[PDB]
TrEMBL record, chain B:
Official protein name in the record: Tryptophanase
Whole-protein residues included: 5 to 24 of 24
GO biological process, one term: transcriptional attenuation by ribosome
Superkingdom classification of source: Bacteria
Source species of the chain: Escherichia coli
Length: 201, 20, 64, 143, 117
RNA sequence: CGGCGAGCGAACGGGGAGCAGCCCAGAGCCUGAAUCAGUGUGUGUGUUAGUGGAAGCGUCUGGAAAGGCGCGCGAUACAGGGUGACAGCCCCGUACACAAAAAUGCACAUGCUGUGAGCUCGAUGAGUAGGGCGGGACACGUGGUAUCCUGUCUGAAUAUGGGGGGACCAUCCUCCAAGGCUAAAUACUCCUGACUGACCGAUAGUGAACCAGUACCGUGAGGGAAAGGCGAAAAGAACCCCGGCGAGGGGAGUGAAAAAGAACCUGAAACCGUGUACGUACAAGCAGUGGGAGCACGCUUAGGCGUGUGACUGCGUACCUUUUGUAUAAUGGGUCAGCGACUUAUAUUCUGUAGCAAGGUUAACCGAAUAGGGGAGCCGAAGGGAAACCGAGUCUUAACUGGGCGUU
RNA sequence: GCACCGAAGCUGCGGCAGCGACGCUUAUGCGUUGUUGGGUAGGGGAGCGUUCUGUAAGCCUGCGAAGGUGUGCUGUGAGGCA
């Protein structure tokens, strides 16, 4: 598997198993969903009858008044105070096997090439911490929406793009599944490629 | 209104034993 | 919380190879002298829990 | 492309809801039937219970006795030992190859098939069929 | 996620009251009452779609009959004729002609009489 | 462990977080020497006010531009709020860079007080251990019951000594009770600050979005409500008319809107009227449904067509529940609106589906924090037997022609 | 003894759906064609709509969003569109 190195046409040579494999939709869909879950925090309200504020006095006699039975003023059937199955803060984190996570990234990369949404480059960096610079580089490179996975990550490339909305920059380890799919184009330095090459084995 | 006090008795009361 | 094994049953059944259960026969613990040797003899070797009771035993021994 | 993914067909069964109307199929009664202990919140009877009748796991006698020595004896497949790392399959060593478990103090070798690399087994026990297979593969079985 | 409910509710309710338009008193005002009125109307209809075909046939047969008698022959004989009148098949409604074209009818009666001779 | 019922439920060992060790039972010399606290000072660092902080205009619709369209500009600042509709460039901020006269938290550094350091030679926790009786604790219900605590009565040895190794004895091994101190990993949030949410949005959410623990109820403890929205801006209606120098209303005027007029956004439903069409005073019942004229209205060019009504007519005893069975004179509902009932967590098993495959997978935890590390461990690849043990067999028996469970 | 009336039974015409086979043709769907489709407890299958997250700094919207009230169309229905 060779990849057109874009700028200095050179070819990079990458693993066919990690860049030329068939797209396993289901398997990715499990991981992307999983990642979207676990984005979640718990943080949730609602007072069971056990925790609404009132005494536990029976509102009125069992029998005698022409009234429905009635037992606790906190009853879910009654008005103020209730909630039959009040929620609690909860954890939505899923598992995702090691081999399934990796399995998904591969199906994702190996699809980004197939739509040449992945353009790999020898070196990528901006010359100063100024957004306008980066805005221009992208302009010149014909890009708006981009992931740009740098090799080791530098100060200036990060501070630019902090304010460009459709563009983010991550180091090699920072690669997550939604992002790969999120942006219209993933850049990635040829240096990063080798990192990823191994991370996925 | 102010209008809000109901102390409804117990049935009301008189009679009934209805053969046993 | 983990299910608790119905401890009494644990002490009367053992999961076998194919997933059966085997038990000791009843009727062999006292008042013996009046029972045929043939009968008592047949009550020594363990035996499989029947198809009908499998449901019960399993529900008693989730960790069998 | 983040709204073009979809799960494998029949990987996400909807799951009974019940109690929501005639059409649903599980309305009103909610598949619980009419009356009795088994309907009703928190209904049901405990495991093993079979009406007040003396339960199976009580009609039948206990016959236990737990070896406790057995708990510290492992069994070894021929398929192992090749993976022991060092051609000497020792009292532990297997232990280090994570095929026994620390607490173990005894071990048989068992004809569970397939040994190739010559290996010498030391301080273990070994079945008639296993010894033969080891030896016939250039192995040695010293006590 | 708490569900407002109640916008869809009046949708369901008004969906029914609309069907109850015309009914007397509560039957057209009060949902609880209307939902019943609406159902049973449906029930009768489903029934009366089958009744309709009964009612009209005996309507037809009734007037087929007078016209037959008018031309001096009972319905009994008269259908038997047309049956026997060398096969030949013809709706009891289409004997419509009994009201709008009485010569054509009498003409049909004769053809029937002949087969019975 | 256990009316061996219901249930209760360890430890050994292993992977991790954090790791730390010291005094008294004392006298001699040397003496205030380590150290700790309390305290004054100093310093640094946080805190309790603060400062600076980029860049937008044209035009269209409109009551109003932040909106559309055009063309510029800042961005280490596109977090967020506001402004007459949705604003990176109007405002307040944000990133970023800065600031403390004073008082303080925290570290060190010392001053003052109190305190002891150090070397030599000593000392080594008795009404205690153990036992008897009664209870209580240990997962352990007295059980074959070690071990721990003690209300009661007792009562040692003292290093050649003593404790423990789950009755108990021997041997072995291992520890030193009957004095204390000790940081971190652990728990919690009345309250302070900042930030977040597949959390609620006025019958929800705190009981309380509102001057609510109020009004109210109760001798008292104590119980305990209802009730949010004019508009962009009050511009909150000068003046005139009816009326009782009224209530209420009609004009006028403000406004995009007054049908937004304060009983004020939206303004549903029950419920009550005015107006019009059609039916209805010889007719009997779940009130509709199938048929169906007439009338009023639209049609169409007619053409037994749409809408509304519905003479007359066939059929026709509501719903729920509960029941062998209900028009039932058996239950429940006066009506509307809003709310109101199979959830959540952890285990276990089955189905589907996905990964990998004789292997599969990690837990805590580390963390460049959904990655990567971590295989402690769990499931499976071998079964049989109560068990020792044997092993593709094994158990049964002296032994199987065998048989039981297993080997595909 | 021959008529005839009479049911949601049989037949006829049109339509839907499951299971069959046969022919057109197989990431199937057609055309036939035989057959099946009352239903409480209850088991199985497939769906509508509501709230909220992403997709979405997109898209619709003061040239009128949500809600309310009519009307037309559409689906087997929960509904949908205008
Ligand atoms: N008449 C009373 C019955 C009754 C009889 N004795 C009473 C004493 C107290 C109250 C009620 C009663 C009723 O309507 O139910
Ligand atoms: N049972 C009697 C007397 C009576 C009246 N009220 C009562 C209440 C309770 C007991 C009895 C009564 C009657 O009704 O004529
Ligand atoms: Mg109480
Ligand atoms: Mg009542
Ligand atoms: Mg509440
Ligand atoms: Mg991981
Ligand atoms: Mg015995
Ligand atoms: Mg019931
Ligand atoms: Mg019953
Ligand atoms: Mg039942
Ligand atoms: Mg191991
Ligand atoms: Mg018929
Ligand atoms: Mg400022
Ligand atoms: Mg500014
Ligand atoms: Mg001591
Ligand atoms: Mg202490
Ligand atoms: Mg409230
Ligand atoms: Mg409201
Ligand atoms: Mg209003
Ligand atoms: Mg009349
Ligand atoms: Mg009458
Ligand atoms: Mg009559
Ligand atoms: Mg009865
Ligand atoms: Mg019944
Ligand atoms: Mg009946
Ligand atoms: Mg009646
Ligand atoms: Mg009744
Ligand atoms: Mg039916
Ligand atoms: Mg909405």
């Amino acid at each position: 598997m060779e990849l057109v190195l874009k700028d200095a046409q050179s070819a990079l040579t990458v693993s066919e198993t990690t860049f030329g494999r068939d797209f396993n939709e289901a398997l990715v869909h499990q991981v992307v969903v999983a990642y979207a879950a676990g984005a979640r925090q718990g943080t949730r309200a609602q007072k069971t009858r056990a925790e609404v504020t009132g005494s536990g006095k029976k509102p009125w006699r069992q029998k005698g008044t022409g009234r429905a039975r009635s037992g606790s003023i906190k009853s879910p059937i009654w008005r103020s105070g209730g909630v039959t199955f009040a929620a609690r803060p909860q954890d939505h984190s899923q598992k995702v096997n090691k081999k399934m996570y990796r399995g998904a990234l591969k199906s994702i990369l190996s699809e980004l090439v197939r739509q040449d949404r992945l353009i790999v480059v020898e070196k990528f960096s901006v010359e100063a911490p100024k957004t306008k610079l980066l805005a221009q580089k992208l302009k010149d490179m014909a890009l708006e929406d981009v992931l740009i996975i740098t090799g080791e990550l530098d100060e200036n490339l990060f501070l630019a793009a902090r304010n460009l909305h459709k563009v983010d920059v991550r180091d090699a380890t920072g690669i997550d599944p939604v992002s790969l799919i999120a942006f219209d184009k993933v850049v990635m330095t040829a240096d990063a490629v080798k990192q990823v090459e191994e991370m996925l084995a | 209104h102010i209008c809000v006090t109901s102390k409804w008795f117990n049935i009301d009361n008189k009679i009934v034993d209805h053969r046993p | 919380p983990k299910i608790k094994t119905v401890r009494g049953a644990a002490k009367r059944f053992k999961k076998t190879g194919k997933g059966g259960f085997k038990h000791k026969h009843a009727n062999l613990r006292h008042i013996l002298t009046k029972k045929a040797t043939k009968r008592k003899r047949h009550l020594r070797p363990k035996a499989m829990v029947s198809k009908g009771d499998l449901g019960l035993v399993i529900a008693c021994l989730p960790y069998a | 492309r983040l709204n073009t993914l979809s799960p494998a067909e029949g990987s996400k069964k909807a799951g009974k809801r019940l109690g929501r109307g005639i059409g649903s199929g599980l309305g009103k009664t909610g598949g619980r039937g009419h009356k009795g202990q088994k309907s009703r919140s928190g209904g049901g009877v405990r495991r093993g219970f079979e009406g007040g009748q003396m339960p199976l796991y009580r009609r039948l006698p206990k016959f236990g006795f737990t070896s406790r020595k057995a708990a510290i004896t492992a069994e070894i497949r021929l398929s192992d030992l090749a993976k022991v790392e060092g051609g000497v399959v020792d009292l532990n060593t297997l232990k280090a190859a994570n095929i026994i478990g620390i607490q173990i103090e005894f071990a048989k070798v068992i004809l569970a098939g397939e040994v190739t690399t010559p290996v010498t087994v030391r301080g273990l026990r070994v079945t008639k069929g296993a010894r033969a297979a080891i030896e016939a593969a250039g192995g040695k079985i010293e006590e | 996620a708490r569900v407002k409910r109640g916008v869809i509710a009046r949708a369901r309710h008004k969906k029914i009251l609309k069907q109850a338009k015309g009914y007397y008193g509560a039957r057209s005002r009060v949902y609880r009452v209307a939902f019943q009125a609406v159902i049973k109307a449906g029930q009768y209809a489903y029934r009366d779609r089958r009744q309709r075909k009964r009612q009209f046939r005996q309507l037809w047969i009734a007037r087929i009959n007078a016209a037959a008698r008018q031309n001096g022959i009972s319905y009994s004989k008269f259908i038997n004729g047309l049956k026997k009148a060398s096969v030949e098949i013809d709706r009891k409604i289409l004997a419509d002609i009994a009201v709008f074209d009485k010569v054509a009818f009498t003409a049909l009666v004769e053809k029937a009489k002949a087969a019975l001779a």
